[PDB]
Design an enzyme around this catalytic site. Structure first.
Site, PDB file in Angstrom:
ATOM      1  N   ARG A 119       0.824  -1.204   0.000  1.00 26.51           N
ATOM      2  CA  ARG A 119       0.000   0.000   0.000  1.00 26.51           C
ATOM      3  C   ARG A 119       0.863   1.262   0.000  1.00 26.51           C
ATOM      4  NH1 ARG A 119      -3.710  -3.581  -0.371  1.00 26.51           N
ATOM      5  NH2 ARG A 119      -5.568  -3.751   0.955  1.00 26.51           N
ATOM      6  N   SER A 138     -10.962  -0.604   4.398  1.00 27.18           N
ATOM      7  CA  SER A 138     -10.237  -1.168   5.530  1.00 27.18           C
ATOM      8  C   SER A 138      -9.545  -0.032   6.273  1.00 27.18           C
ATOM      9  CB  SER A 138      -9.240  -2.223   5.066  1.00 27.18           C
ATOM     10  OG  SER A 138      -9.907  -3.433   4.750  1.00 27.18           O
ATOM     11  N   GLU A 163      -5.008   2.984   7.289  1.00 23.51           N
ATOM     12  CA  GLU A 163      -4.954   2.690   5.865  1.00 23.51           C
ATOM     13  C   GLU A 163      -5.728   3.705   5.038  1.00 23.51           C
ATOM     14  OE1 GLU A 163      -3.820   1.134   3.447  1.00 23.51           O
ATOM     15  OE2 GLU A 163      -2.743  -0.656   4.119  1.00 23.51           O
TER      16      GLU A 163
HETATM   17  C1  LIG Z   1     -15.666  -0.871  -0.281  1.00 22.33           C
HETATM   18  C2  LIG Z   1     -14.206  -0.535  -0.432  1.00 22.33           C
HETATM   19  C3  LIG Z   1     -13.299  -1.547  -0.726  1.00 22.33           C
HETATM   20  C4  LIG Z   1     -11.941  -1.274  -0.876  1.00 22.33           C
HETATM   21  N1  LIG Z   1     -11.085  -2.321  -1.167  1.00 22.33           N
HETATM   22  C5  LIG Z   1      -9.821  -2.057  -1.305  1.00 22.33           C
HETATM   23  C6  LIG Z   1      -8.927  -3.157  -1.607  1.00 22.33           C
HETATM   24  O1  LIG Z   1      -9.259  -4.332  -1.751  1.00 22.33           O
HETATM   25  N2  LIG Z   1      -7.607  -2.788  -1.740  1.00 22.33           N
HETATM   26  C7  LIG Z   1      -7.107  -1.504  -1.604  1.00 22.33           C
HETATM   27  O2  LIG Z   1      -5.894  -1.325  -1.749  1.00 22.33           O
HETATM   28  N3  LIG Z   1      -7.955  -0.472  -1.318  1.00 22.33           N
HETATM   29  C8  LIG Z   1      -9.241  -0.746  -1.178  1.00 22.33           C
HETATM   30  N4  LIG Z   1     -10.106   0.289  -0.895  1.00 22.33           N
HETATM   31  C9  LIG Z   1      -9.556   1.646  -0.739  1.00 22.33           C
HETATM   32  C10 LIG Z   1      -9.584   2.464  -2.029  1.00 22.33           C
HETATM   33  O3  LIG Z   1     -10.475   1.877  -2.978  1.00 22.33           O
HETATM   34  C11 LIG Z   1      -8.173   2.527  -2.618  1.00 22.33           C
HETATM   35  O4  LIG Z   1      -7.288   3.077  -1.649  1.00 22.33           O
HETATM   36  C12 LIG Z   1      -8.049   3.347  -3.906  1.00 22.33           C
HETATM   37  O5  LIG Z   1      -6.674   3.383  -4.290  1.00 22.33           O
HETATM   38  C13 LIG Z   1      -8.572   4.763  -3.793  1.00 22.33           C
HETATM   39  O6  LIG Z   1      -9.118   5.163  -5.067  1.00 22.33           O
HETATM   40  P1  LIG Z   1      -9.885   6.527  -5.238  1.00 22.33           P
HETATM   41  O7  LIG Z   1     -10.246   6.716  -6.715  1.00 22.33           O
HETATM   42  O8  LIG Z   1     -11.019   6.618  -4.285  1.00 22.33           O
HETATM   43  O9  LIG Z   1      -8.781   7.601  -4.875  1.00 22.33           O
HETATM   44  P2  LIG Z   1      -8.897   8.682  -3.721  1.00 22.33           P
HETATM   45  O10 LIG Z   1      -9.485   8.069  -2.506  1.00 22.33           O
HETATM   46  O11 LIG Z   1      -9.655   9.889  -4.284  1.00 22.33           O
HETATM   47  O12 LIG Z   1      -7.394   9.044  -3.475  1.00 22.33           O
HETATM   48  C14 LIG Z   1      -6.481   8.090  -2.894  1.00 22.33           C
HETATM   49  C15 LIG Z   1      -5.066   8.477  -3.242  1.00 22.33           C
HETATM   50  O13 LIG Z   1      -4.883   8.395  -4.674  1.00 22.33           O
HETATM   51  C16 LIG Z   1      -4.240   9.565  -5.123  1.00 22.33           C
HETATM   52  N5  LIG Z   1      -4.615   9.809  -6.509  1.00 22.33           N
HETATM   53  C17 LIG Z   1      -5.826   9.579  -7.107  1.00 22.33           C
HETATM   54  N6  LIG Z   1      -5.863   9.909  -8.377  1.00 22.33           N
HETATM   55  C18 LIG Z   1      -4.587  10.392  -8.628  1.00 22.33           C
HETATM   56  C19 LIG Z   1      -3.975  10.904  -9.787  1.00 22.33           C
HETATM   57  N7  LIG Z   1      -4.591  11.022 -10.966  1.00 22.33           N
HETATM   58  N8  LIG Z   1      -2.690  11.304  -9.689  1.00 22.33           N
HETATM   59  C20 LIG Z   1      -2.059  11.187  -8.519  1.00 22.33           C
HETATM   60  N9  LIG Z   1      -2.534  10.720  -7.363  1.00 22.33           N
HETATM   61  C21 LIG Z   1      -3.810  10.337  -7.485  1.00 22.33           C
HETATM   62  C22 LIG Z   1      -4.681  10.660  -4.160  1.00 22.33           C
HETATM   63  O14 LIG Z   1      -3.758  11.742  -4.167  1.00 22.33           O
HETATM   64  C23 LIG Z   1      -4.673   9.897  -2.832  1.00 22.33           C
HETATM   65  O15 LIG Z   1      -3.387   9.918  -2.225  1.00 22.33           O
HETATM   66  C24 LIG Z   1     -11.486   0.044  -0.729  1.00 22.33           C
HETATM   67  C25 LIG Z   1     -12.390   1.060  -0.437  1.00 22.33           C
HETATM   68  C26 LIG Z   1     -13.747   0.785  -0.288  1.00 22.33           C
HETATM   69  C27 LIG Z   1     -14.700   1.908   0.029  1.00 22.33           C
HETATM   70  C1  LIG Z   2     -10.596  -3.514   1.774  1.00 20.70           C
HETATM   71  C2  LIG Z   2      -9.258  -3.365   1.710  1.00 20.70           C
HETATM   72  O1  LIG Z   2      -8.357  -4.484   1.543  1.00 20.70           O
HETATM   73  C3  LIG Z   2      -8.707  -5.768   2.191  1.00 20.70           C
HETATM   74  C4  LIG Z   2      -8.951  -6.753   1.092  1.00 20.70           C
HETATM   75  O2  LIG Z   2     -10.216  -6.470   0.527  1.00 20.70           O
HETATM   76  C5  LIG Z   2      -8.955  -8.245   1.516  1.00 20.70           C
HETATM   77  C6  LIG Z   2      -8.544  -9.099   0.338  1.00 20.70           C
HETATM   78  O3  LIG Z   2      -9.670  -9.767  -0.183  1.00 20.70           O
HETATM   79  O4  LIG Z   2      -8.028  -8.611   2.590  1.00 20.70           O
HETATM   80  C7  LIG Z   2      -7.819  -7.560   3.623  1.00 20.70           C
HETATM   81  O5  LIG Z   2      -8.910  -7.444   4.420  1.00 20.70           O
HETATM   82  P1  LIG Z   2      -9.146  -8.652   5.533  1.00 20.70           P
HETATM   83  O6  LIG Z   2      -7.811  -8.973   6.192  1.00 20.70           O
HETATM   84  O7  LIG Z   2     -10.148  -8.227   6.571  1.00 20.70           O
HETATM   85  O8  LIG Z   2      -9.708  -9.981   4.673  1.00 20.70           O
HETATM   86  P2  LIG Z   2     -11.328 -10.275   4.405  1.00 20.70           P
HETATM   87  O9  LIG Z   2     -11.485 -11.262   3.261  1.00 20.70           O
HETATM   88  O10 LIG Z   2     -12.071  -8.989   4.105  1.00 20.70           O
HETATM   89  O11 LIG Z   2     -11.891 -10.961   5.823  1.00 20.70           O
HETATM   90  C8  LIG Z   2     -10.981 -11.834   6.433  1.00 20.70           C
HETATM   91  C9  LIG Z   2     -11.699 -13.082   6.924  1.00 20.70           C
HETATM   92  O12 LIG Z   2     -12.139 -12.858   8.144  1.00 20.70           O
HETATM   93  C10 LIG Z   2     -13.787 -12.864   8.098  1.00 20.70           C
HETATM   94  N1  LIG Z   2     -14.268 -11.780   8.883  1.00 20.70           N
HETATM   95  C11 LIG Z   2     -13.756 -10.425   8.690  1.00 20.70           C
HETATM   96  C12 LIG Z   2     -14.262  -9.303   9.518  1.00 20.70           C
HETATM   97  C13 LIG Z   2     -15.295  -9.555  10.576  1.00 20.70           C
HETATM   98  O13 LIG Z   2     -15.698  -8.668  11.247  1.00 20.70           O
HETATM   99  N2  LIG Z   2     -15.808 -10.906  10.786  1.00 20.70           N
HETATM  100  C14 LIG Z   2     -15.299 -12.041   9.943  1.00 20.70           C
HETATM  101  O14 LIG Z   2     -15.718 -13.135  10.117  1.00 20.70           O
HETATM  102  C15 LIG Z   2     -14.152 -12.762   6.814  1.00 20.70           C
HETATM  103  O15 LIG Z   2     -15.366 -13.525   6.584  1.00 20.70           O
HETATM  104  C16 LIG Z   2     -12.971 -13.401   6.035  1.00 20.70           C
HETATM  105  O16 LIG Z   2     -13.151 -14.715   5.931  1.00 20.70           O
HETATM  106  C17 LIG Z   2      -7.586  -6.168   3.047  1.00 20.70           C
HETATM  107  N3  LIG Z   2      -7.487  -5.357   4.294  1.00 20.70           N
HETATM  108  C18 LIG Z   2      -6.153  -5.015   4.849  1.00 20.70           C
HETATM  109  C19 LIG Z   2      -6.083  -4.216   6.150  1.00 20.70           C
HETATM  110  O17 LIG Z   2      -5.156  -5.352   4.289  1.00 20.70           O
HETATM  111  C20 LIG Z   2      -8.631  -1.968   1.800  1.00 20.70           C
HETATM  112  O18 LIG Z   2      -7.377  -1.841   1.692  1.00 20.70           O
HETATM  113  O19 LIG Z   2      -9.356  -0.955   1.994  1.00 20.70           O
END
Ligand SMILES: Cc1cc2nc3c(=O)[nH]c(=O)nc-3n(C[C@H](O)[C@H](O)[C@H](O)COP(=O)(O)OP(=O)(O)OC[C@H]3O[C@@H](n4cnc5c(N)ncnc54)[C@H](O)[C@@H]3O)c2cc1C
Ligand SMILES: C=C(O[C@H]1[C@H](O)[C@@H](CO)O[C@H](OP(=O)(O)OP(=O)(O)OC[C@H]2O[C@@H](n3ccc(=O)[nH]c3=O)[C@H](O)[C@@H]2O)[C@@H]1NC(C)=O)C(=O)O
Length: 322
Positions: A182, A231, A301
């Protein structure tokens, strides 16, 4: 308490004329972030194309703060707002996703991750199924080395194209990005405009399968239909955040309109009318209670951002530790 956008635009008389993207003052950042909370952005700019951006960077002086956002799915904005300019590149201008050969994809930085998922399926390319669940944009993926399901952005990045704060182009490579968990080491003044992706060709019935397993996980274990930034905290080595949070007794914990999701307790939910203060206070309340319960100090995060209102500062861990 923060000059209006008017006053900002008035001081910048004529140097911004000739820009084709929209300039909106005093746009709430709750309108533009997944948490649906935060305070005003002094001026929102939405450049039409890379040259509208480059022109706007050459035009704005360096002393004025700039912030680039995509979909705002990783931002917790404070209720005092964001001074200077907030740049959200235009979908029409920076959302294109096209195949260039037989293993590579080019995507503008505004393109939602999920469009890169569908584009790889339509090209027989494996390793893009993890963008099907991440609701952010490609600009934030490249910056956050976004990843899930065991795949990260860094592994599909060939070369990135960006503008610096002087509006000069930069074609930077996977090595230059300096990727980690990240994290990217690329300069923070850089604005990503597009990227070249590369995946290994594969069977489409398989790419579907993985994308349906990706989406089934999201719908089943995460609250991805809610107002949330995802997260909240990184998983501490040898354990997981949601667990250490549930252990501290924090599943369902409320601060105002903000709640720790009972479904997945590393997610912070705006149940309707949560303020920025509500969300950062919940986070630092959880940090405090998990530290006290386990000695683990959780690492954010989600990016906290903007200004506190007068008399509304929040101390990390609620001042209990430093
Ligand atoms: C339901 C949900 C699930 C998610 N799952 C994941 C996951 O599995 N893995 C994960 O890593 N994150 C996850 N996230 C977090 C988020 O989606 C990521 O961090 C993503 O990178 C942010 O994208 P954004 O378009 O919202 O950017 P923003 O939130 O608007 O910005 C995030 C960063 O990106 C930079 N940025 C954006 N566009 C540009 C650009 N054109 N040039 C330079 N910098 C730029 C911004 O400066 C900032 O530092 C999740 C969020 C939600 C709500
Ligand atoms: C969402 C993000 O990234 C996520 C990413 O989606 C998934 C990959 O599938 O694994 C991380 O979550 P995570 O460690 O909680 O993995 P998950 O698959 O979401 O859940 C873990 C396991 O524990 C269970 N779980 C999780 C939360 C809870 O309250 N109860 C529960 O039972 C889930 O069912 C699952 O079986 C990343 N989070 C971090 C801190 O690294 C983000 O960066 O914003």
């Amino acid at each position: 308490m923060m000059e209006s956008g008017e006053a900002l635009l008035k001081k910048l008389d004529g140097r911004l004329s000739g820009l084709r993207g929209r300039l909106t003052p005093d746009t709430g950042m709750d309108k533009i972030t997944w948490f649906r909370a935060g305070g005003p952005a002094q001026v929102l700019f939405q450049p039409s194309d890379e040259e509208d951006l480059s022109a706007f960077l050459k035009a704005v002086p360096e002393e004025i703060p700039l912030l680039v956002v995509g979909i705002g799915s990783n931002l917790l904005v404070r209720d005092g707002g964001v001074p200077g300019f907030v740049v959200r590149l235009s979908a029409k201008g920076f959302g294109e996703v096209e195949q260039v050969c037989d293993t590579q994809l080019r995507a503008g930085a505004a393109a939602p991750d999920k469009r890169v998922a569908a584009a790889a399926l339509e090209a027989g390319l494996a390793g893009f199924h993890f963008y099907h669940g991440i609701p952010g944009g490609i600009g934030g993926a490249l910056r956050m080395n976004a990843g899930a399901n065991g795949v990260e952005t860094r592994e599909r990045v060939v070369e990135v194209r960006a503008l610096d704060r002087k509006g000069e182009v930069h074609v930077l490579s996977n090595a230059d990005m300096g990727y980690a968990y990240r994290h990217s080491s690329a300069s923070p003044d850089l604005i990503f405009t597009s990227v070249l992706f590369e995946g290994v060709p594969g069977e489409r019935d398989d790419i579907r399968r993985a994308m349906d397993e990706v989406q089934h996980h999201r719908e089943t274990v995460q609250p991805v239909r809610e107002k949330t930034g995802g997260s909240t905290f990184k998983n501490p080595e040898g354990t997981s955040a949601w667990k250490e949070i549930d252990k501290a007794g924090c599943r369902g914990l409320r601060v105002g309109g903000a709640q720790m999701s009972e479904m997945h307790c590393n997610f912070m939910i705006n149940t309707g009318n949560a303020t920025g203060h509500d969300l950062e206070t919940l986070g630092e309340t959880v940090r405090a209670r998990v530290f006290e319960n386990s000695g683990i100090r959780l690492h954010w995060e989600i990016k906290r951002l903007g200004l506190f209102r007068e008399g509304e500062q929040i101390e990390e861990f609620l001042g209990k530790i430093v």
